[PDB]
Write an enzyme that holds these catalytic residues in place. Structure first.
Site, PDB file in Angstrom:
ATOM      1  N   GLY A  39       0.716  -1.193   0.133  1.00  0.00           N
ATOM      2  CA  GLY A  39      -0.249   0.233  -0.172  1.00  0.00           C
ATOM      3  C   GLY A  39       1.063   1.081   0.016  1.00  0.00           C
ATOM      4  O   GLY A  39       1.902   0.523  -0.452  1.00  0.00           O
TER       5      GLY A  39
ATOM      6  N   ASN B 112      15.944  -0.148   6.887  1.00  0.00           N
ATOM      7  CA  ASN B 112      14.451   0.301   8.420  1.00  0.00           C
ATOM      8  C   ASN B 112      14.665   0.870   8.765  1.00  0.00           C
ATOM      9  O   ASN B 112      14.709   1.110  10.417  1.00  0.00           O
ATOM     10  CB  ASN B 112      14.705  -1.102   8.625  1.00  0.00           C
ATOM     11  CG  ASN B 112      14.047  -2.550   7.838  1.00  0.00           C
ATOM     12  OD1 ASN B 112      13.230  -2.259   6.720  1.00  0.00           O
ATOM     13  ND2 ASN B 112      14.020  -4.134   7.614  1.00  0.00           N
TER      14      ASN B 112
ATOM     15  N   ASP C 184      10.386  -0.695  10.706  1.00  0.00           N
ATOM     16  CA  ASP C 184       9.295  -1.098  10.035  1.00  0.00           C
ATOM     17  C   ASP C 184       9.713  -2.574  10.598  1.00  0.00           C
ATOM     18  O   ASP C 184      10.519  -3.564  10.756  1.00  0.00           O
ATOM     19  CB  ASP C 184      10.354  -1.773   8.931  1.00  0.00           C
ATOM     20  CG  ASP C 184       9.670  -2.852   7.430  1.00  0.00           C
ATOM     21  OD1 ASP C 184       9.562  -3.549   8.301  1.00  0.00           O
ATOM     22  OD2 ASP C 184       9.959  -2.766   6.741  1.00  0.00           O
TER      23      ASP C 184
HETATM   24  C1  LIG Z   1      10.818   0.081   4.741  1.00  0.00           C
HETATM   25  C2  LIG Z   1      11.952   1.473   3.738  1.00  0.00           C
HETATM   26  C3  LIG Z   1      10.891   2.169   3.053  1.00  0.00           C
HETATM   27  O1  LIG Z   1      11.175   3.536   2.129  1.00  0.00           O
HETATM   28  N1  LIG Z   1       9.792   2.788   3.606  1.00  0.00           N
HETATM   29  C4  LIG Z   1       9.105   4.082   3.362  1.00  0.00           C
HETATM   30  C5  LIG Z   1       8.233   3.710   2.701  1.00  0.00           C
HETATM   31  C6  LIG Z   1       7.467   4.934   2.827  1.00  0.00           C
HETATM   32  C7  LIG Z   1       7.706   6.223   3.430  1.00  0.00           C
HETATM   33  C8  LIG Z   1       8.827   6.074   4.298  1.00  0.00           C
HETATM   34  C9  LIG Z   1       8.755   6.661   4.937  1.00  0.00           C
HETATM   35  C10 LIG Z   1       9.499   8.346   5.657  1.00  0.00           C
HETATM   36  C11 LIG Z   1      10.587   8.775   4.065  1.00  0.00           C
HETATM   37  C12 LIG Z   1      10.525   8.050   2.417  1.00  0.00           C
HETATM   38  C13 LIG Z   1      11.452   7.813   1.995  1.00  0.00           C
HETATM   39  C14 LIG Z   1      11.594   9.685   2.053  1.00  0.00           C
HETATM   40  N2  LIG Z   1      12.271  10.008   0.852  1.00  0.00           N
HETATM   41  C15 LIG Z   1      12.292  12.233   1.060  1.00  0.00           C
HETATM   42  C16 LIG Z   1      12.652  12.362  -0.652  1.00  0.00           C
HETATM   43  N3  LIG Z   1      13.784  11.964  -0.420  1.00  0.00           N
HETATM   44  C17 LIG Z   1      14.409  12.445  -2.708  1.00  0.00           C
HETATM   45  C18 LIG Z   1      13.721  10.041  -0.896  1.00  0.00           C
HETATM   46  C19 LIG Z   1      13.598   9.636   0.140  1.00  0.00           C
HETATM   47  C20 LIG Z   1      10.820  10.925   2.997  1.00  0.00           C
HETATM   48  C21 LIG Z   1      10.408   9.882   3.786  1.00  0.00           C
HETATM   49  N4  LIG Z   1       9.566   8.819   6.404  1.00  0.00           N
HETATM   50  C22 LIG Z   1       8.781   7.783   7.119  1.00  0.00           C
HETATM   51  N5  LIG Z   1       8.676   7.847   8.466  1.00  0.00           N
HETATM   52  C23 LIG Z   1       7.906   7.675   9.303  1.00  0.00           C
HETATM   53  N6  LIG Z   1       7.837   6.340   8.594  1.00  0.00           N
HETATM   54  C24 LIG Z   1       7.946   6.023   7.383  1.00  0.00           C
HETATM   55  O2  LIG Z   1       7.199   4.896   6.840  1.00  0.00           O
HETATM   56  C25 LIG Z   1       8.033   3.828   7.046  1.00  0.00           C
HETATM   57  C26 LIG Z   1       7.206   2.223   6.727  1.00  0.00           C
HETATM   58  C27 LIG Z   1       8.095   1.135   7.676  1.00  0.00           C
HETATM   59  C28 LIG Z   1       6.126   2.556   7.130  1.00  0.00           C
HETATM   60  C29 LIG Z   1       8.543   6.700   6.487  1.00  0.00           C
HETATM   61  C30 LIG Z   1       9.342   5.166   4.699  1.00  0.00           C
END
Ligand SMILES: CCC(=O)Nc1cccc(-c2c(-c3ccc(N4CCN(C)CC4)cc3)[nH]c3ncnc(OCC(C)C)c23)c1
Length: 313
Positions: free
Chosen positions: A28, A146, A159
């Site tokens: 999702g 993670n 994660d």
């Molecule tokens: C597990 C790997 C991964 O990338 N997970 C992910 C996916 C989408 C958003 C985020 C995230 C992000 C996040 C991920 C990527 C970015 N961008 C910023 C722009 N840059 C160019 C690339 C990276 C900015 C924020 N911040 C979060 N905070 C709290 N929970 C999250 O999600 C946690 C998961 C476990 C639900 C996320 C993390």
């Protein structure tokens, strides 16, 4: 064991706004947004993990399992669950980590990352993991992907989709067959699917190797099936160029086949803290050493913005 008196807060859909899509997958979409709890003059930057379909029963059980373990931790170096929303599609509301994964961050700023940050990150991750050990929780998926970046100076473990809480009087978790990241796993996990806090220490060392190589893939080009025989032959990941033997020895100790011979996260904190006192002695790197939330969340009024780390109940 001790009763788990963590609170699980159920949030109204109408008291948080979605601003933009951070990322998407079959599981999702993860949104970025504001949570404005009614009656309180606060605005929490949040990441909102929505589940793709409402109809998958296995996916709904898995996202509530993730909420269960995330609500059961309260540490500065672990990402905190703000609540869940029981809409047609379930939504996890988490503390926003603006800068993304630590893996993507080090690949993005190879040139501008100094030893002070790398060693502090190692300390912070060890502190998070040692907290998870006190909570009797095995993460089972510790990796640089993670670990998220709140600020360049503050990282948090996240994660928990694979994390398992150890039952009373047990120190091992036996897992059923499932998709699992082999190149980060202790040998006893690959062969016998046994997971302990000392199995997480193995993953800690690979995570540190990821940071020290500025985002390299462990065992690049090697199939995961062969990893077990490679480990049993005594081969390990090689010393990263910036690492003094003082740092690399700690990584090597994390990859002892005897799990009890590996360091405890308690000891990893101490050792990397010493090195964080004089960083350029342990890592040799070339060339070493309010409105932000408005731009991020695209909202003019940020007077009442509060990070979840300053929001408690
Ligand atoms: C597990 C790997 C991964 O990338 N997970 C992910 C996916 C989408 C958003 C985020 C995230 C992000 C996040 C991920 C990527 C970015 N961008 C910023 C722009 N840059 C160019 C690339 C990276 C900015 C924020 N911040 C979060 N905070 C709290 N929970 C999250 O999600 C946690 C998961 C476990 C639900 C996320 C993390």
């Amino acid at each position: 064991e001790a009763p788990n008196q963590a609170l699980l807060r159920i949030l109204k859909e109408t008291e948080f706004k979605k601003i933009k899509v951070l990322g998407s997958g079959a599981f999702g979409t993860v949104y970025k947004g504001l949570w404005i709890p009614e009656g309180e003059k606060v605005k929490i930057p949040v990441a909102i993990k929505e589940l793709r379909e409402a109809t998958s029963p296995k996916a709904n059980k898995e996202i509530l399992d993730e909420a269960y373990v995330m609500a059961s931790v309260d540490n500065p170096h672990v990402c905190r669950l703000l609540g869940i929303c029981l809409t047609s599609t379930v939504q996890l509301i988490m503390q926003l980590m603006p800068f993304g994964s630590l893996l993507d961050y080090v690949r993005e700023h190879k040139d501008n990352i100094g030893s002070q940050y790398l060693l502090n990150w190692c300390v912070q991750i060890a502190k998070g993991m040692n907290y998870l050990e006190d909570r009797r929780l095995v993460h089972r998926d510790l990796a640089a992907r993670n670990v998220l970046v709140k600020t360049p100076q503050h990282v948090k473990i996240t994660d928990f989709g694979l994390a398992k809480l150890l039952g009373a009087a047990a120190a091992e978790y036996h897992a059923e067959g499932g998709k699992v990241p082999i190149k980060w796993m202790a040998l006893e996990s690959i062969l016998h699917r046994i997971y302990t806090h000392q199995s997480d220490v193995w993953s800690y060392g690979v995570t540190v190797w990821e940071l020290m190589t500025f985002g390299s893939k462990p065992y690049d080009g090697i199939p995961a099936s062969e990893i077990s025989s490679i480990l049993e032959k005594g081969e390990r990941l090689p010393q990263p160029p910036i690492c003094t033997i003082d740092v690399y020895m700690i990584m090597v100790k994390c990859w002892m086949i005897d799990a009890d011979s590996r360091p405890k996260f308690r000891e990893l904190i101490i050792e990397f803290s010493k090195m964080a006192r004089d960083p350029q002695r342990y890592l040799v790197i070339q060339g070493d050493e309010s409105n932000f939330y408005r731009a991020l969340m695209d909202e003019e009024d940020m007077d009442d913005v509060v990070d979840a780390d300053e929001y408690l109940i």
